[PDB]
Design a protein around this ligand. Structure first.
Ligand SMILES: CC1=NN(c2cccc(S(N)(=O)=O)c2)C(=O)C1
Length: 164
């Protein structure tokens, strides 16, 4: 079946808990595979040790820039960027996992977890999974955001990997 992966998240060096994500490899296999491998770190790089650098309450929590830690960086397992696979899955509500980008066909490693329905991103960002467990952790992360996206605590993915 579809992969299950996890992110263990600290805020200011203390654990918040675990976010478990189902990756919809049946719908977006290339996008799911990228995220899966970045969680395990099996290509020699990935999300371990990186941050949620942009968090906006009542919108989303963004992470995945493991090269520049500020929204400008990241890379995929395929190369620096890869195409929009499809827009079949929609930003239906809280817990949606979707790719951040800088316009069409600029997926790398950055991603966000929605804390509300973000319908205006449908057709612009590739949705590829959702939160199975740990929305409480996501709400904690969200609470450390701001309108500007600047976080008020340092939010770090201390560990990540694949459960199945
Ligand atoms: C304003 C900011 N926008 N971003 C940013 C960086 C990568 C992707 C995206 S996006 N187009 O929301 O998925 C936003 C920042 O990091 C700060």
């Amino acid at each position: 079946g579809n992969p299950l992966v996890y992110l263990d998240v600290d805020a200011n060096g203390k654990p918040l808990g675990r976010v478990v994500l189902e990756l919809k490899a049946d719908v977006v296999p290339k996008t799911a595979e990228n995220f899966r491998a970045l969680c395990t770190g099996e290509k020699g790089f990935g999300y371990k040790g990186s941050t949620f650098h942009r968090v906006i309450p009542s919108f989303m929590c963004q992470a995945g820039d493991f090269t520049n830690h500020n929204g400008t960086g990241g890379k995929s397992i395929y190369g620096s960027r890869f195409p929009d696979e499809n827009f079949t899955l929609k930003h239906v509500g809280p817990g949606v996992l979707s790719m951040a980008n800088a316009g069409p066909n600029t997926n790398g490693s950055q991603f966000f977890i929605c804390t509300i329905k973000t319908d205006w991103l449908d057709g612009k960002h590739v949705v590829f999974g959702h939160v199975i467990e740990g929305m409480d952790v996501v709400k904690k992360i969200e609470s450390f955001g701001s309108k500007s996206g600047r976080t008020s605590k340092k939010i770090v993915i201390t560990d990540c990997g694949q459960l199945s």
